[PDB]
Every structure is written in C-alpha cells, then in structure tokens.
Design a protein around this ligand. Structure first.
Ligand SMILES: [Mn+2]
Lengths: 99, 109, 79, 103, 105, 87, 106, 101
DNA sequence: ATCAATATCCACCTGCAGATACTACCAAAAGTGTATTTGGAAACTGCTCCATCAAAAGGCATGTTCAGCTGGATTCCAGCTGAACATGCCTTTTGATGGAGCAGTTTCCAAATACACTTTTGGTAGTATCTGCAGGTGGATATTGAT
DNA sequence: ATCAATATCCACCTGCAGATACTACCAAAAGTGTATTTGGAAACTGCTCCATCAAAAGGCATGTTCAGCTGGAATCCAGCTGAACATGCCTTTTGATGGAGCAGTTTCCAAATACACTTTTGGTAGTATCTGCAGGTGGATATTGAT
C-alpha cells in the first residue's frame, strides 16, 4: 500500500510534544497547528539561509554550528535572541558529552 | 540504533531530520556536526516561546484548545515576536482590538 | 460584476476591522482598484509557478511561493 | 405615517459599534463566490482554462482581505493627520505612495 | 521726503529655500560633513564593541547610505505636511512617514 | 604614542544647517524648530541598526576591523542595498 | 572556439558557469543555464547604458558617471521597479519640487 | 622590481561592461565610480536570478537548474517589458549554443 | 437626574464538526562501523592600509537681530454621509456525479559530470603619457523685488 | 511698468588626478576531449477534489428618506522661522611615519564524506469512541439617548 504514500513530513508530532512540556492540559486545533508548522519551516529557512550566505562571504564551505549562532544573532530581536543563542549552546555541549 | 540524537541533546526536535533538510536545500557544501543540534535547539525554543503565550491567550478567552486567533493575539501583543513576524500574515488570525482615540464619543476623550 | 462583485458594505466591513468610523463615498471605487492591483500582481506570480511544474491547476503552494516573494508571507497552507 | 419619536441610534454610533464587533471576530468579510469569481476573471488573462484548489482561492482571500485591513489603518491614520475622521481616497493615495506602491 | 521703507536688499522668506531646494537636488555630494559624521560611526560602534576599527571606506559607505535615507525620509515627510494642507515639516510628519513605512508600529 | 579620548554626544556633529540641506534636497521648504532634534535621533537608530550588523559580521571571521564589504551585507540584509562600495 | 562566441555573447559564459556552482543555488548546473544567464546580465548592462549614455549627452558630458546612472535608472519605469531597494552611490536625486510649494498670486 | 606575495584576483566585469558599452556608445567613457556601480549591478542581478531559480527547483524536487528555470526566474524577478526582451535575448543565446557543434 | 429602549454579556443546555485513541502497515529515514578525503585550522610573515600626527588656512557653522506670513485657532454652514427601513435578488451549501488532472510508476537515453590534458586569458604590476572637466574668472542675461 | 540689485547661466580657460595605454609575466581559469553516471522527460492510468447541477432557504445587499455635523472655507493675531549679517572655529587638507592586523603560502589531523549494511519509526488508512464548544435560551443589565 505504497501508492499515495509520498510522505508529507512535518513537525506536528514535535509541535504537540513541546505544546505539552509547558501547557499539558491545553490543546491545539489543526488550523492553528498548521500555522505552527508554517512557523518552524519559516524560522528554519531564514537561519539556514542567513548562514548559507555567511559561509560564502568568508570563503568557507562548511556550515559549522558557529554559522548558526551568528545567523540567529543577526536575525533575532533583542532579548528574544539572547535566549536562543543560549539554549542552542546548551544543547550542543550536551551532544558533545554524549555516547 | 540505540539512542536518538534528539535525546542525546535532550530535545523534541529531530536533530536527525534537520541534518537532512540542511543537506537537501543546498545551504553549504558541508553541514557540521553541531550545526543541526544548534539549529534544532533554537527552533525548538522559539516554538515553545509562542505556544506558551498562545496557551495563555486562550486561557484568557475561556478556552482549552488553541485556535489561530490564539496565535495572532499571542504574537502582536509581544514586542520582540511582533518584529520577528513583523511582515507575516497568519491565516484566520484576525487583529488586536484597537480603536483610534480621536474616534471616541463626545469630541475627543 | 466580478470587480463590482465586491460589495460596498463588504468594503465597509473590511474597513471597520481596520478601525474606521466614517467612510467617504469615493473610497468604494478607489478600494476596488486597490484590490485589483494586489490580485493581478499575486496571481501573475502564482500562475508562473503553476506553469513551471507543467500544470493546468493553481495549488495553494503556488500561492504561498507567490505571496512570499511578493513580500506578504502567509502561514497556514504550506504543506 | 407618524411614529412618535422612535429609536434612531445617533449616527457614527452604529458604526463605532461595528468596529468593536469586527475586530473581535475574524471571519473573512467578503462573500466567497464574487471573490472566487474575481480570482478566476484575472488569472484567465495569464493562462486560459485553469483551476483553483479551494484552499488556494482562500489562501488568496486571507491575503487580499488582510492586506486591505492593514492598509485601512494606515489610511485612517493618514486621514486623522489632516485632522479628519472620514477616509477619503486622497488619504489612501498617500498611504500607498509612502509604502512604495505608487512608488 | 520721509516715506519709502529702507533700501538694503532682502530676499523674501522662502525664495532662498527654493533657490536651495533647487540646488542640492541638482547634485550629489553628501550634505553631512565627514569628520563629525565620522566620530558617530566610531562612537555608536565602541558602544557595541571596543578596540574595533573601520575602513577609510566603510565609514565612507555608512555615509552615502544613512545620508540618502533622510533625504528620502524627508522626501516622504514633505509629502505628509502637504497632505495635512501644510508647507512645514513638523516631527509628527516623520513619525507618520515612519509608521506607515513599517518603521514603527 | 596612542591617543583615544572619551567619545560622547557626537550626534551633535550632525548639525542644523546640514540637517537643513538633507531637507533642502528632500524637496523641503519650511523647517520647524523640532525636526532638527527628531531627525538626529531618527539617524541614531539607523546607524545603530546597520552597525550592529556590520559588526556582527566583522566580529565573526575573527577580525578587528569593519570593512567596506562588511557594511554592504549589513545594508542589503536590511533592504537598503547600496551599489558602489563593492561585492 | 569560446563559449561566448559559441553563443554570440560578450558576457563570460564560462565564468558565470562557475558562479552557479560555487554558489550552491542547486546541486547540478545545466548547459543552457550559464549561457541563458550571461544573456540576461549582458542585456541589462546594455539597457542601462543606452540610457546612462544619453543621460550624459543631455548635460554635455561624454564619460558616464554614477549620477548619469541615477537619471537612467530613475527616469525609467521598469528599471526603477527593478531597483526600488537599490541606492545609487552619489547619484543625487531626480529634480523635483512639489506644487503647493511655489510662490504666486503676487 | 615587481610583484608582492601574489595578491588574490578581484575578478570584476569591468571589461565585459566596457565591451558592451562601446557597442551602445562608441564615443562615451565611464568613470571608476560610474562603472563600479555597474559591476555590482551585474553582481546583484546574478544573485537574484540564480537564487530565484534555486527556489523554483526546490519547489519541484529538481536537483538541477535548466535555462528554463533561469527563464522562469527572469519572468518572475523582472518587471514587464524588461522581462520579454531578456527572455528572448536569453533563448537567442541558447538557440545559438544548441546549433553549434 | 429619569426611564424607557436595545444591545450586551454570563451561566447553563445540548449536539457534531473535528480532535483523539487503537492496529496493521512499509518504504525510507536514520543511526552504526568502515575506509577514505580534505576543509580549515595553525604558525609564520610579507605588506597594504589606518590611526595619528602636524601645521596652515578658509569655507562653514554660530549666534544674533529682525520682521514676513505660515500655522492655529475661531466661527460657520452647506451638503455629504450614517441611520434606518423596505424589498428581494443573490449567495449559500449540501449533497454527490462525471471526469479532468494531479500525481503516481515503470522506462531508458540524452544530459550532467567527473576525469586529465592543453590553450588561452584576464588581472596585477609596472611604468608611462595623455585628456575631460572641475574650477576659477568675467561678463551677459535671468529672476526677484521695492517702487 | 521700469529700475536696481542679485544670483545664474555660459563661455573660456587651466591644472592634473584620474583616466586610458602599452609591455610583461602568468596561476587560474576555459575549453577539449573521453569515459561514466544519472536526473528527469515520456507515457500510461489510478483516484482526490474541482466544476457545474440541483434547489431550496433567508441571509445579506440595494435603493430611499431623513437630518446630524463633519469638512472646509473664510478672517484674523500670535510669534515661528527664514534672511541676513557679523565673526571665528574646527573641519579640511595634504602629507609622513610606525605598525597593527590582515592575508597569503606550508603543514597536518580531527572531523566530515561516501558507503555497505541493520534497524527504527513517522506517515498512511481505515476504523471507532471521544469531546470542547458554537450556537440556542433565558433573564440580567449596561450602554445609549431620549426627556
Ligand atoms: Mn561609548
């Protein structure tokens, strides 16, 4: 049964996960979910892109994790940026000290 | 497999899928090892950030489940997200309740 | 009617949401012009996307890809 | 005939009341048919004999409508700046220009 | 005979402005003086980041950019007074020109 | 042999006559008393803005100098793309 | 024989090719691609000088400069909308003065 | 008494401009700054055409940009009359390169 | 201040559009050991380019007085517009069939590309002499402005 | 309508930085030619949802009377704002010395790539109970706007 099975992969299952890790009793409609899936794709491409250009001005080819730091730094407003950089240096150090 | 790279970082955002999406889009010749962790993390948080306020927004309007209207009200009422979505239109979002003050009854008050 | 298909009260309804008390008489036509500019502009881009993927049908992605580059990004349809 | 002074809400008040009503609601304020007609009438001139996935037309209806709304706040602001409260097309024309449309 | 104002030449209020509205428009040099617009590209920086230095020609680019702007922010702001049936630019003008641009709210 | 004195209140180096000429060229006639102050601020943000990007770049490929090209990205990327100074 | 000649152009048909690879806009580059491009780029270059060249004759100069280019670009419907977020470096501004700012009725 | 630790080449279109200049005006010069503006003109229009086709392909799962994507870009990216003539001018160049050899 | 005259907002009611719970499903997406490839990091250094001086001037900004008239406030009043009310046409939509066409799947070669030479060129360097026009002078005609 | 009193054009002129010009090497890039790989057109048909039919139903639009006031216009006095005129300062200018700090070439390995190969799981596809809530009903009473 693989015919109409061209995978429409999303973040919905991951969006709901994080939905609960803060508001466990609150739900999310499919319409509002879609927005929340438009958002992640959006915020991805930008940071991704701003880092895609960032290598090239420097004559580099490897998009290291540093690229992302700046990409986000350049991209994200005031305080809302100071936090992101943190949480993303948090997760990287965890992975660096992993199996 | 043994332990997901997601949980090896401690997240709910696929630190695997990112790494593919970054390779399929052609953003660089070589995506680093840290890159998709960082990127996923950063995304994950921002999505927590909205939802937080998007939960609260509904809880003000006596509701349990989130509608688009709960996103739009969440977003604009907050300065730094408003700028981050400064030029985005959420479908069926609506608009914040505001009326210009010169239009108030009895001349201007 | 088409462009006359958009109604004076609907315009008043869309204007009210903007936060407008008093709507002058000419507005209704001017707006109907303003509305066409937008549309012509979007669809032209959208249709150009359709025609690339060799199709006789405008997808709701042709539209996002269009509304994006226009400069009016729309969350809620992207997949 | 005669009516013995009935109720006639003072002008602008039914207007200023509708403002509150529509800002609080979110439903698309254009009849869907005439829109789905105007969408079909324009695109024909770019490609003849086409189709619109019902979402796409609404996607556009969310965009077109939501544009206008914002554009109307800019107008009203422009208008009030002339010390007025009635939006004339002379107002719209400034808002479009500044934004860079007629520009 | 006692009756005829004075004689010293005075050009009416506005007909030097037009003489200038005519002139700067004509050409192209930057209307902000270098050294003083320098110290502000030095200064706004060190306030983000100290020990940093600029290229003779970045500060020459940060000009023609932040210049240009005003002269075209002002472009938009003339337009605006004129629209309030005026001929004078008052701060509220700019602030409306900024808002609608999407520079504010 | 180094110099470097305190650098304060240099928005004044942007002077009323010049804040005039910008406004002359603007196509502008009668300059109210305030504009002079409102603009200087209006200019700070802009500089302020283009600069915490111009730098965020320099700060990156490990440099201590902001270049012509350095700015250009900080312009472009904000929707003010300039031709002339390169790239 | 060169790929410029091969195609008729002047704009480096090989050099635009590389920059479509080094950029990573997509993975694989076509054969028409880099040609079809150096055609556009050239045409435009060509377009904006049949303008900024005449610009120059109008004010009796005979060497193109930035300012001529501003008249060119700005006095021209399409180019102008192609260059709405561009900034011509020392290219003044199209002469223009609004109406209600003119002195009359003696 | 020449050359210092081989300086990297700043390969501009200065010459391809001037060559396409003299065609339009045989007896008109151009400054550095006049010019230096045109380079980033080229430079700029590139990034956009390429990039826009880059998008077209990724909305089509195409791992390649053909001259047909470049065209679609040009047709989206450029305003009206500027589009047509470029489109044609473009094909004309392809046409000639798929008729030699 | 009074009180009808209507629109507003709260608890309480029930039904279904629409989110949730369960299994079978399967390509493909991802993690895991292997073997190879080189990006970029380093340390050293040639070398352009910026900070910094210095000393001399001269257009340029400062402040100041003075008065032309634009902005702002006042009264006003004519006609545009909101209100409301009567029709009454036009959208709604559901409820479900042909049938396009998107979208899926097996083909198969023309088209990309990675591969190693070979010819060419366009950029820096170097030196060297032109030539377009800022720029400064002067004298004719235009604009503005008090009679 | 002049007549003085200014800036403004326009012409002629020079001085020289900024143009254009040859020689020269030359590392990289462009092209040529082969083996080798493969992305996507080429065409066939399965079904998801698009289009017009049907056909009520009344919600929502259009024309119409009335008069409330909002826009604009017409007059008038404060004092803002430009014009000008005297001075004097700090930018500008043209040049010269470290030398900071950028950049180009040599070396080497951690990390990243392609790859054969085992496994997990997110999307599909029905199938079926669950469920917060969108509209219905009081009956309150707040906001409106007449008295
Ligand atoms: Mn400081």
């Amino acid at each position: 049964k693989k015919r109409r099975k061209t995978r429409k992969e999303s973040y919905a299952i991951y969006v709901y996960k994080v939905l609960k890790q803060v508001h466990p009793d609150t739900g999310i409609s499919s319409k509002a979910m879609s927005i929340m899936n438009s958002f992640v794709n959006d915020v991805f491409e930008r940071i991704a892109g701003e880092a895609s250009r960032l290598a090239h001005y420097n004559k580099r080819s490897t998009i290291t994790s540093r690229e992302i730091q700046t990409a986000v730094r350049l991209l994200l407003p005031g305080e809302l940026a100071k936090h992101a950089v943190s949480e993303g240096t948090k997760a990287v150090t965890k992975y660096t000290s992993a199996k | 497999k043994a332990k997901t790279r997601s949980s090896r970082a401690g997240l709910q955002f696929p630190v695997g899928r990112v790494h593919r999406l970054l390779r399929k889009g052609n953003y660089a010749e070589r995506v680093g090892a840290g890159a998709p962790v960082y990127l996923a993390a950063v995304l994950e948080y921002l999505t927590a950030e909205i939802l937080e306020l998007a939960g609260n927004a509904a809880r003000d309007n006596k509701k349990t489940r989130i509608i688009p209207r709960h996103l739009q009200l969440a977003v604009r009422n907050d300065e730094e997200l408003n700028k981050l979505l400064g030029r985005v239109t959420i479908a069926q979002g609506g608009v914040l309740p505001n009326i210009q003050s010169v239009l108030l009854p009895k001349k201007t008050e | 009617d088409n462009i006359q298909g958009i109604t004076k009260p609907a315009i008043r309804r869309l204007a009210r949401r903007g936060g407008v008390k008093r709507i002058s008489g000419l507005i209704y036509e001017e707006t109907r012009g303003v509305l066409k500019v937008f549309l012509e502009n979007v669809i032209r881009d959208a249709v150009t996307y359709t025609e690339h993927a060799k199709r006789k049908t405008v997808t709701a992605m042709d539209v996002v890809y269009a509304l994006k580059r226009q400069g009016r990004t729309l969350y809620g349809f992207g997949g | 005939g005669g009516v013995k002074k009935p109720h006639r809400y003072r002008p602008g008040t039914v207007a200023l009341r509708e403002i509150r009503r529509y800002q609080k609601s979110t439903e698309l304020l254009i009849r869907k048919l005439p829109f789905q007609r105007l969408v079909r009438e324009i695109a024909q001139d770019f490609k003849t004999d086409l189709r619109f996935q019902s979402s796409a037309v609404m996607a556009l209806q969310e965009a077109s409508e939501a544009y206008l709304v914002a554009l109307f706040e800019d107008t009203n602001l422009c208008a009030i700046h002339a010390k007025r409260v009635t939006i004339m097309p002379k107002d719209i024309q400034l808002a479009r220009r500044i934004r860079g449309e007629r520009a």
